[PDB]
Design a binder for this molecule. Structure first.
Ligand SMILES: [Mg+2]
Ligand SMILES: [Mg+2]
Ligand SMILES: [Mg+2]
Ligand SMILES: [Mg+2]
Ligand SMILES: [Mg+2]
Ligand SMILES: [Mg+2]
Ligand SMILES: [Mg+2]
Ligand SMILES: [Mg+2]
Ligand SMILES: [Mg+2]
Ligand SMILES: [Mg+2]
Ligand SMILES: [Mg+2]
Ligand SMILES: [Mg+2]
Ligand SMILES: [Mg+2]
Ligand SMILES: [Mg+2]
Ligand SMILES: [Mg+2]
Ligand SMILES: [Mg+2]
Ligand SMILES: [Mg+2]
Ligand SMILES: [Mg+2]
Ligand SMILES: [Mg+2]
Ligand SMILES: [Mg+2]
Ligand SMILES: [Mg+2]
Ligand SMILES: [Mg+2]
Ligand SMILES: [Mg+2]
Ligand SMILES: [Mg+2]
Ligand SMILES: [Mg+2]
Ligand SMILES: [Mg+2]
Ligand SMILES: [Mg+2]
Ligand SMILES: [Mg+2]
Ligand SMILES: [Mg+2]
Ligand SMILES: [Mg+2]
Ligand SMILES: [Mg+2]
Ligand SMILES: [Mg+2]
Lengths: 127, 167, 122, 111, 185
RNA sequence: UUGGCGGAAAGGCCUUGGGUGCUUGCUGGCGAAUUGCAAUGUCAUUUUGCGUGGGGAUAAAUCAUUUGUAUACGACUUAGA
RNA sequence: CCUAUACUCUACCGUCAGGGUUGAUAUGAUGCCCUGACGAGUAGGCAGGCGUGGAGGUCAGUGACGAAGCCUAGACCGUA
RNA sequence: AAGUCAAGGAUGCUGGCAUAAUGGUUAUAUGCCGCCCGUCUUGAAACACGGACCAAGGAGUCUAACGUCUAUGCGAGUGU
RNA sequence: UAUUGGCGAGAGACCGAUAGCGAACAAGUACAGUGAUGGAAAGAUGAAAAGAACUUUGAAAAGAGAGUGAAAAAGUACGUGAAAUUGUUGAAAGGGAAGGGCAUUUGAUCAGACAUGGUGUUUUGUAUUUCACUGGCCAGCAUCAGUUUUGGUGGCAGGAU
């Protein structure tokens, strides 16, 4: 049901991790640039980790798109849901994490009435 | 609200493609594929079998037969890219092959619900095969050993270099 | 936890060279074993099919004292106590059978090959 | 540099395959005589072969034609440089200097 | 690689899209960039670049300066254009009947101009009266009359106003300023 | 199945006799299709387990005790129906 | 004959420069679009953004039908 | 001539599957590469110094007086 | 007019238990020093103790049950309960380190799209419907475009024609 789009290609699907996040526990794997003077990562020696740069930027025609082909949009209620009434082929609803189940059923009912795609239609449901 | 809004939404009307400029000229077959040539089937269910070539069909396929009495290859269509044109030539004047075309070979496509859990032939197709092969075998009987040649399969032996082999 | 302990012959039973006789630990563990057997016979268990299925030890909070060292220094002298727990279970029979249905996906060529073999054989 | 005396054939192949003009400081592919008669129509030059003529027969407006021509971005030669080691003189078995008429083969390989 | 003969990716150094966030100035520059794009007149481009200018590059233009500019021959009936503000001047006593287009007018300047029979014009009314600058006369105020340019290029034998807070005797009028105390600059 | 030969890591080579199957040495008859225009289109051998039904045989070692030709402890050397 | 992050061609990302585009209907003129070139980087400078505590406004926002927090070789977006 | 075209960027026909099959993630294996970070230094993997590990805290701030620049208000005045 | 003391008040774009006064608690306390002096750490069960009666193993502590409670994944070592580090279970690898990057195999694990409007009523609930297709992944062939590589062959021109 998505809009036609080019083939989504990611120039670097692997996550950029901070140097020595595997070595030390205090060093998290969120990316920080090595500002050291002897750093092989900063000097870009062969066989070391790659650094994020603008050449890895995604195509603007396929940026922010899910593999389904839409852009996700966080919703908390049906009034936020109804903004996507005319844009079902470009946007996909995403029910926020702090929505109760008795409201999630209402959002899901309105979304299946309006033809809007929900990308988490399994939150807090019972069976 | 959780997310605010986009200030402008992308329009949903899909654009039209440009008027392309790719005409479809007919296929130019290679010089060794003349009607009546013995080909060697390189792939498929009947791989390694020698079959006579009859007619260049519409969708760039070659209409062949075994004959079916000889090696069990029925009237069939193959791809010209997956055969080897052996220089052994038989003359196929005397057959009315103009009956067959792409709609003669129809699969009668299967629905998705019909899944083969565990597990027929056209009388027209078997009689057409019987019509063509009885005219083909009269020409096959002229030169010696051609029937046995078509019945035997082709295979590469130890020391056979296909870049030096002549067919 | 066996570095620089002595060698012995009684490890030959276990293919090891280092073994000991921790009497205090054996006392505590066999007391807990007696308690678990009592709980099992109170539950009404078979008491002859009982094998110790789970047993784990982890570290309790330390109990600290002081040591007096040369040149007027203080060091720690701490016991490392234990939380011990164990579960003895009845030895049951064979577990189960009848694995999954193993749904098969075959191409048209594979189906034709199977049909051709079924025709060519009896 | 390696330089020499170009022939009409290699000049024509250069201008036809890699032909780029400088049009308000932009590198514009030629691909049509309208561009050339718009930018060099003052001094009689109308077409790409007229430009080639002004180039090879060194005319009064060779400076304007050659400055309109963007510098040709050639590739490495397709059959190699012919020598094991480039940076000697062409006389000494290298590649630089004046390979007076052998520049045509090198440019046709590099083009 | 390239042997670069210039600095790569350098900005033009010229201000576009003024640093102010005044929405009326944004409407004015929208109108005049349309006019500069299509009216093929240099006046629109001139006032478009002048709309970008900062405050020190937009000095006020006095009505005495306007009268002096109108006293040129053949300019008695032109439309004065001041990209900026117009301040008045009590140093004049008579004022002609001209029309003045400007961003701002001080109260005294507007009163003087409308008392002399003329009129004060905004730049959009100027645009609908003269889209290509018909019979216009652009005026610029003096830029090098600020107090900051006195101290620009300070050095020996420049005569260039040392940066000082207190003035008078004994505030830098000594050794380095007269020959009786050492040397003279 | 008879008779040999082979010890370098032989574990294989040769041979007698009969049985049984095939033979494209030659001439015939029938069959193949639909895997749909290709999809390795699956054919090998390596180990283990579990069943049947047919043979075959019904032990030691260690700990503990002991010895002192041995020994830091292990180990080693001995003994004990 | 082999192959460098070098040269050629193409795509994509960003930057810079030059341009086009207020016409009606529908949104965003800092918007959209076209063209060309360029992209190493310590000290350092500048710009655009991400995140945290609190304050004004707004979403008549979420929430005991479970907020915040914490765990999760489960998923998605972004070069980050 | 109608029109056609390889003329300012790929269309046509056909098959299989429609599922973890392609793909993503993760662990392992294999080929090649990969010295430990931060720092002072002409020069650090250094037989130069700090660092056993982990949580939390942790370092260009505020003020008086000013320079340039920018924005705003008024303007021979301005500053309640 | 001043007022970091005292008494009494009202407030805050302040801090929120390693912060804020040293001190949110029996804090200038415990404690150290001959002494002058120095000087901490330490908040939170639950709405309500309803703080586990009673049975059984144990010498006992306690455990196992039972029970209270909305919840003992709240048991006076008590809100939430991270990391370092540790135990058990499961999975994987391991010939003088381990860890990492590019690429893929193998194993494990996982998201997405597969309806679509549609001639059509072969229809039941008589207007729901009866529906053949739809669109996604992986490929093959033909004719082209751009870039490039490797061949075969033809016609010419020059030299001491
Ligand atoms: Mg880490
Ligand atoms: Mg360095
Ligand atoms: Mg040791
Ligand atoms: Mg010792
Ligand atoms: Mg002592
Ligand atoms: Mg002492
Ligand atoms: Mg080559
Ligand atoms: Mg070389
Ligand atoms: Mg470059
Ligand atoms: Mg621009
Ligand atoms: Mg704060
Ligand atoms: Mg929650
Ligand atoms: Mg984890
Ligand atoms: Mg996978
Ligand atoms: Mg895969
Ligand atoms: Mg994998
Ligand atoms: Mg790994
Ligand atoms: Mg190496
Ligand atoms: Mg030194
Ligand atoms: Mg050294
Ligand atoms: Mg030092
Ligand atoms: Mg140290
Ligand atoms: Mg911190
Ligand atoms: Mg405190
Ligand atoms: Mg304190
Ligand atoms: Mg609870
Ligand atoms: Mg709790
Ligand atoms: Mg707790
Ligand atoms: Mg842990
Ligand atoms: Mg081509
Ligand atoms: Mg070619
Ligand atoms: Mg000749």
């Amino acid at each position: 049901a998505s809009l036609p789009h080019p083939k989504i290609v990611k120039k670097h699907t692997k996550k950029f991790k901070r140097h020595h996040s595997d070595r030390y526990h205090r060093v998290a794997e969120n990316w920080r640039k090595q500002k050291g003077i002897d750093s092989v990562v900063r000097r870009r020696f062969r066989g070391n980790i790659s650094q994020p740069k603008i050449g890895y930027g995604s195509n603007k025609k396929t940026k922010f798109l899910s593999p389904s082909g839409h852009k996700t949009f966080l919703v908390a209620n049906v009034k936020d849901l109804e903004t996507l009434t005319m844009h079902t082929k470009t946007y996909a609803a995403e029910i926020a994490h702090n929505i109760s189940a008795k409201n999630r059923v209402v959002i899901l009912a309105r979304a299946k009435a309006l033809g809007i795609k929900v990308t988490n239609p399994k939150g807090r449901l019972a069976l | 609200t959780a997310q605010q809004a986009p200030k402008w939404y992308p329009s949903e009307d899909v654009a039209a493609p440009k008027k392309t400029r790719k005409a479809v000229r007919p296929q130019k077959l290679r010089a060794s594929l003349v009607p009546g040539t013995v080909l060697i089937l390189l792939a498929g269910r009947f791989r390694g079998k020698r079959v006579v070539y009859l007619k260049h069909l519409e969708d760039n396929t070659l209409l062949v037969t075994g004959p079916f009495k000889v090696n069990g290859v029925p009237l069939r269509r193959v791809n010209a890219r997956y055969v080897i044109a052996t220089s052994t030539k038989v003359s196929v004047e005397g057959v009315n092959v103009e009956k067959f075309n792409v709609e003669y070979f129809a699969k009668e496509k299967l629905t998705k619900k019909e899944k083969k859990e565990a597990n027929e032939i056209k009388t027209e197709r078997v009689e057409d095969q019987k019509v063509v092969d009885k005219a083909l075998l009269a020409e096959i009987k002229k030169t010696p050993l051609l029937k046995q040649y078509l019945s035997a399969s082709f295979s590469l032996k130890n020391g056979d270099k296909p870049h030096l082999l002549k067919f | 936890f066996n570095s620089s302990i002595g060698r012995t012959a009684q490890g030959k039973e276990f293919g090891v060279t280092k073994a000991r006789w921790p009497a205090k630990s054996v006392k505590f563990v066999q007391g807990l074993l007696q308690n678990a057997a009592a709980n099992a016979e109170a539950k009404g268990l078979d008491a002859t099919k009982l094998y110790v299925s789970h047993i784990q030890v982890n570290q309790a909070p330390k109990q600290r004292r002081r040591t007096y060292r040369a040149h007027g220094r203080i060091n720690k002298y701490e016991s490392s106590p234990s939380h011990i727990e164990l579960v003895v279970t009845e030895k049951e029979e064979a577990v189960a059978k009848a694995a999954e249905k193993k749904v098969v996906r075959l191409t048209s060529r594979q189906r034709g090959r199977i049909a051709a073999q079924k025709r060519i054989a009896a | 540099v390696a330089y020499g005396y170009p022939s009409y054939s290699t000049i024509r192949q250069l201008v036809y395959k890699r032909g780029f003009g400088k049009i308000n400081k932009q590198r514009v592919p030629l691909s049509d005589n309208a561009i050339i008669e718009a930018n060099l129509g003052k001094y009689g030059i109308l077409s790409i072969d007229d430009l080639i003529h002004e180039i090879i027969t060194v005319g009064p407006h060779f400076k304007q034609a050659n400055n309109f021509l963007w510098p040709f971005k050639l590739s490495n030669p397709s059959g190699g440089w012919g020598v094991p080691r480039k940076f000697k003189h062409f006389i000494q078995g290298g590649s630089f200097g004046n390979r007076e008429e052998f520049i045509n083969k090198l440019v046709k390989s590099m083009n | 690689g390239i042997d670069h003969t210039s600095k790569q990716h350098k900005r033009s150094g010229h201000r576009t899209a003024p640093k102010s966030d005044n929405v009326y100035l944004k409407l004015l520059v929208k109108l005049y960039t349309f006019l500069a794009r299509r009216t093929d007149a240099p006046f629109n481009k001139v006032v478009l670049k002048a709309l970008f200018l900062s405050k020190i590059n937009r000095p006020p233009v006095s009505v005495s300066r306007i009268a002096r500019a109108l006293k040129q021959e053949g300019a008695a009936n032109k439309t004065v254009v001041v990209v900026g503000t117009v301040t008045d001047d009590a140093r004049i006593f008579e004022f002609p009947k001209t029309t003045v287009a400007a961003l701002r007018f001080t109260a005294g300047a507007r009163a003087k101009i409308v008392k002399a029979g003329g009129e004060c014009i905004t730049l959009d009314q100027l645009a609908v009266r003269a889209p290509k600058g018909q019979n216009t006369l652009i005026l610029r105020g003096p830029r090098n009359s600020r107090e900051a340019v006195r101290h620009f290029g300070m050095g020996p034998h420049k005569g260039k106003a040392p940066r000082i807070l207190s003035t008078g005797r004994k505030f830098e009028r000594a050794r380095g300023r007269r020959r009786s105390k050492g040397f003279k600059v």
